[PDB]
Amino acid sequence: NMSLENVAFNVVNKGHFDGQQGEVPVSIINNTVYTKVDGVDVELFENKTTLPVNVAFELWAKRNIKPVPEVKILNNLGVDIAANTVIWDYKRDAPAHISTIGVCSMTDIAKKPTETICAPLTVFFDGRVDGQVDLFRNARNGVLITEGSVKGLQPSVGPKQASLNGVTLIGEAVKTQFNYYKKVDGVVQQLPETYFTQSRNLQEFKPRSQMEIDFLELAMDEFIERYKLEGYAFEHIVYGDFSHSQLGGLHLLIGLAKRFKESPFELEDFIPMDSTVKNYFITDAQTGSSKCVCSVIDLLLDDFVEIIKSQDLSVVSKVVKVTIDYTEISFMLWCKDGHVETFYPKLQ
């Protein structure tokens, strides 16, 4: 029943694969899928993946169209494969995982998660689908998300936001905050205390706390005085130093957002992927200050204040580990004379 022409039928009639019968004529050329509409070819899908065009086309058509965790979250938890679904990575325009389970015959390593080949793999389970909670209880390694309680399992509350068709949002007509569960070698794991990134962007940045509202409204000197931030180098870390050829600091996305409203700048996303810490080649258009590797993270400003105020500042330099998005992020803390010189996330 599986066929390329049937997949294209579902896309043109249902917007995605819906399991409907029918076939439309398809021509494949230039890593692109076309269909003939009233005698002319219309592009349906441009393959941006490393997979064959018809294979990637099928996986994208069968992508999950419900609110799902962001890929960085699934990566930080070590997820290798999804159970009977396709998590589409819109950052890479490619499937988030190599193989599939009961989805596409060309990429399927198994039909159901209980098969032997799935034993060493951390399978992602969705409690919103019938039987996936019970499948998670019988899985050796797996990650489970639910909207409510699971009897006999202690939950971990995830981020407020989730990805819906490549749109990260805090749901109002839909539920985006899940309970997280993980098993390793048959043993349920206790997930650690973690912060969560806010997954915002520059153009559409919106404050989510009165501190962030005051950060964008007030000036630098007035904001640092109001929240008693003297001696923490927020002028460097958050606001950024543009007086020299090498750009200084500017490691919080909200600091880039405040600057972007005043003056534009160039951000080179040379590792285009979903990750907790993003690295950009930045060039400021107003001053000419630039930096090849500017590590940026989108933390709630209140959370970043709690972190930097929770450190010992009696050492010149050391490595600070912070659990964010269920992964350990290494920060580099520099201090002189008991005050913060700088504080930034490292590469990986």
Place this chain on the structure above:
Amino acid sequence: NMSLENVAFNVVNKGHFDGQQGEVPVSIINNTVYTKVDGVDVELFENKTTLPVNVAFELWAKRNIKPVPEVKILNNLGVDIAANTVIWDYKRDAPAHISTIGVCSMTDIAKKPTETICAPLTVFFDGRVDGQVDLFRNARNGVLITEGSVKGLQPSVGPKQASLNGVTLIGEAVKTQFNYYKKVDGVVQQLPETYFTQSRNLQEFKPRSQMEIDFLELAMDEFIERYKLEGYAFEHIVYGDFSHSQLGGLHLLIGLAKRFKESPFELEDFIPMDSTVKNYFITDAQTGSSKCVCSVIDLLLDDFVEIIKSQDLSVVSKVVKVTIDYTEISFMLWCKDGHVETFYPKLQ
């Protein structure tokens, strides 16, 4: 006299093919045409069509650079080929028709429209070109456009707007509203009464009536009261329902325009082509409400009111046919207790 290097000469010197003599050096690689400018290669054309690169390059260079009907109009009239010109489909970045007549030797099926091979085809004629009106009188099947009257033929007034170099506009320094004529098997046809879509877009939406001006300025409850629209489900059909996971209604482009100014959303144009009814996979960023197939049409708000007020509302559901852009559009009308439940265009 035809040559690839001569076509590239005209593009670099005249912006398009102008019939001038000359040749520039050309290199073709990666479905792209390049020319050497002072020792370096400069991209001239990236082939986005299903045709060979050099063939598509020639057709695009010879595209019509005058105001022409939008492709959806030509499609709805069943046009198969153009007479001694190339209608470029900027929505697909491809020629609107497969074959040509007296344009490109590789795609030409004939040199002049009077040839035998053109008999079963609906040829598009442009009265603004000398002799094309008379050629239309001797053609078996054809469509003719003019700026003025044609002796012995009853005209049909077309849309106010036309496409100029992929820019749809109502001409002020140029004439964009044409008279339409059609012949089938040698018999002149009488074109039916039809509405016309406005061919506007979200970012640059501009109201074209006081009702549309009031729709964007006033609130929903205030607008429905002013124009006495109680019982027609404009809250659902036009304004859209975002309270549930499945997006409800929102089938008029002006309703999307009003929403877009307040909150952003994602529109997946999974059938990228010019058509009277567009189908989008929509995801609302503020609420999370989404719908795989949201049929949207850009009618003048006054015209849509006239249509929905001209229907019988005593049946649960039925199919309503409306002639728009010279084609029959099937709508689905749902009523309960004598009032409109919903009313939306179908797929095709």
Place this chain on the structure above:
Amino acid sequence: NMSLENVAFNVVNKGHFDGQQGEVPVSIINNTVYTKVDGVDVELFENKTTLPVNVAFELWAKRNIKPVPEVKILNNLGVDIAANTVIWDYKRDAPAHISTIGVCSMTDIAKKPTETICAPLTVFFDGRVDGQVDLFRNARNGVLITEGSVKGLQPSVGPKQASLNGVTLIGEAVKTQFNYYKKVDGVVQQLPETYFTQSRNLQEFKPRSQMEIDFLELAMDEFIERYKLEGYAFEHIVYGDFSHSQLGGLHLLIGLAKRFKESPFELEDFIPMDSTVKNYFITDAQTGSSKCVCSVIDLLLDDFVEIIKSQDLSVVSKVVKVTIDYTEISFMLWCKDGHVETFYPKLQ
């Protein structure tokens, strides 16, 4: 349920498309069709055509696997399209015709030859298939082949040989000699009296007459005196002149076969296609004699003798039109003092 995966299923299980149901996983990459056979991809089809890979793959799978006329015959008769089949051009590794009739959705212009679109086209009908003779009677332009007589239709006996899966042969377990019929504008044409090329190859050349047996066995001076060929320039036309830098004569394939068994040479087929007359760039390896455009034709030697011996030798230069493979082949006849200088086919 026509599909790419179903076409591949028939190919792997039946060697071609046999109308069986079933699907196998398919990967498309680099203009090649692959399928998974126990883990690894196996190449099924390398697209050598100008069509999309999946389209040409379907047409090749649906190619006619019965003895069919050689493409040069169909070309000389002006065939543009076949009725409900695909004639595969094995010399081009591509379909012999652009469009199809009731074969492939992507290339079909019609499902039946009786449709209006097929009238101006010369449709090829196979009288061995039920109902094709009647369709030929109803077609405006067409070509018909049959094994026996059709009531009322004056036949034209075709060549002894036909192409079976790319192998040209005179059938013994199957019949390769057909009657030929042609209609132009609804009127049956009388096919002209014609010679036929023998369609032999240089490697596996085999004589077909006692004269051809003698030509290969006998020396030049012995053969010319035996069959009384003095004054007919066979030393030049058939045997060829290698004494000069520019190769002279050598226009009959049997003359090439005789030279090849002695000393090899290089044949550059710069127009790789099936045609009654072939043009080659020839380079003799032993002497170094060459010629850019060498016109070669594979006639029965007895036929060529019959042709050359019926010419008027009293003119310095005369064009001579001979009907070969149902097409008129022009020859250049040069004579001097009551004997011919040369007599070769034009490249045309």
Place this chain on the structure above:
Amino acid sequence: NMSLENVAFNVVNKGHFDGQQGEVPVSIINNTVYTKVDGVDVELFENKTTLPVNVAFELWAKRNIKPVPEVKILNNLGVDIAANTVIWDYKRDAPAHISTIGVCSMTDIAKKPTETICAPLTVFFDGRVDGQVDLFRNARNGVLITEGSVKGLQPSVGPKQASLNGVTLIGEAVKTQFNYYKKVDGVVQQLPETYFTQSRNLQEFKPRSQMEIDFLELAMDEFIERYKLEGYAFEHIVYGDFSHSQLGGLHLLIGLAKRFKESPFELEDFIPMDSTVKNYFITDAQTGSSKCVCSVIDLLLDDFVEIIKSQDLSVVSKVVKVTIDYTEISFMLWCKDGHVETFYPKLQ
């Protein structure tokens, strides 16, 4: 320091990857690897695989250059991956296996076969390499080849021939006959008693028994009476029937070799891969007899005689399973009135 330029250095200096240090300039274009040799690019590798060009280039350079089992043997044993080597499939011009173990970073699933990821996979071990026998003892699923005895392991004597750089041969200066061992789920399997195909080709076929010498020299009626083969349908099974349009029988490669020396024919290998039974689309050039799916197997003629002469001829139709190349091959045995009608291998 693994790199593309270093791999190319080894290829140009050592003919393959030899672990030497050095780099040469490399150009990648059109799925081909080039290198500059005194100004001009020389092609080193044309990627015929479904892998990226640089990846397949590295795997081909690291291919095993010692006598290795033929891929059909490894396939019939269920091998999925090799331990610290690459088995190159020369019939597919591609690696015989998808992933690698400690070979290439792009395709490695592990650096050592003992890693957890390799347990459910059947790993191929080469006992000629130090430490591979011990790794086989510790592997859960695996296949081992050795030249001599392993203490405690009951051997299975493999075929006389092996593949050396794409050349299948019975070694004289090297040993090509191995012992075979197999483990499934940590338990050593006893390999079944099996016949082996001879792996000869049609062009360079050479007999290997006095019976095979007789078959090629003797006539059909003389050979059948000599080896007392009356009532075993050798005229059909081995010699083949060409009297009808559909080719009959001809299922032993030695029968094809006998026919080929007399008159040539066309073999279309629509599944180009190494397998115990091969399916061909055959077209006989002399008679025109053909058959879409012709199952062929290259057994020693004495073996096939031993097989056919041990069957019960008292049943109309019976399936017969024979273990050949360590896999069960199904045959169709048709008998009528105390003698066989046909006896051919299924395409399976």
Place this chain on the structure above:
Amino acid sequence: NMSLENVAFNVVNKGHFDGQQGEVPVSIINNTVYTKVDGVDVELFENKTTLPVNVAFELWAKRNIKPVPEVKILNNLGVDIAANTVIWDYKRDAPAHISTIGVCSMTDIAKKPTETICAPLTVFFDGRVDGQVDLFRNARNGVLITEGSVKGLQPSVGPKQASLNGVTLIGEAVKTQFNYYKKVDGVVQQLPETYFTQSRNLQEFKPRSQMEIDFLELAMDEFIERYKLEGYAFEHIVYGDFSHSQLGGLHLLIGLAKRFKESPFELEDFIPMDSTVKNYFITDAQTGSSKCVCSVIDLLLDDFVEIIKSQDLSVVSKVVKVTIDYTEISFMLWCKDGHVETFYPKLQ
């Protein structure tokens, strides 16, 4: 009026570029040039070069069709570019040089060799063309070939054979032996006394001396005693050793031709290019002996005997430089107890 369509016109009508006027329709797709011949596309050129498809097509059409020196000769002389012509490397299916002079606008660095840009480059001049000898006198760096004497210039007699359209031959109807001249920095260089390789192939090998006739006819022990070759390791150097797993010796092409007529073997040319010494990955099919890097050279056997018999046999290991094809070839001479062990050319 240089154009792609005009180049294709010359190719189809003249077999190459002949400067004739005319255009034919051309389709470019998949690094191949096509043209329409009565409806269907016929392949004219498959780009095997690293240049753009239309550029390499033009250079191939403008290739030199006269007897030209073999590329290895031009390489050994350091030629970088040709004057107003294209030397086509048929072993690479690519131009022998990167840039051109007055040939193709895309690859031209100059229209005349006298231009300033050509001075540091070694330009190849063909004295058979009017005015090229004078251009050689005015060029700073260059190489000149002539058929006869040039006044004042001391000639160097080149090899007997030359390449005519990819066919290397000793001309009879044409002259393939030239005088050679070379200038470096405006000063004429005296070319060294040199041997020449015979440029034969393994399939069509033909001896060129009574000694070579004897070597092929006579047995090893009979030949070595006949030409008094005791103590010169011809059993190893020329005949080759197959008794061991690693192939020994076999460095003269005539030795390969003798072995090939007896039993076939596999030659892998991992550096496919024209060079005085060729390196092959050899696998003997009969014995299984192989060697990754086998240096082979096609000298006249009498020349190699003259070379080996002039060496001092009193040293264990000595490097020996011999000028062959105008370049110095290094040999490894191993001797032991008054006789040679081996004597082979280095891979260099």
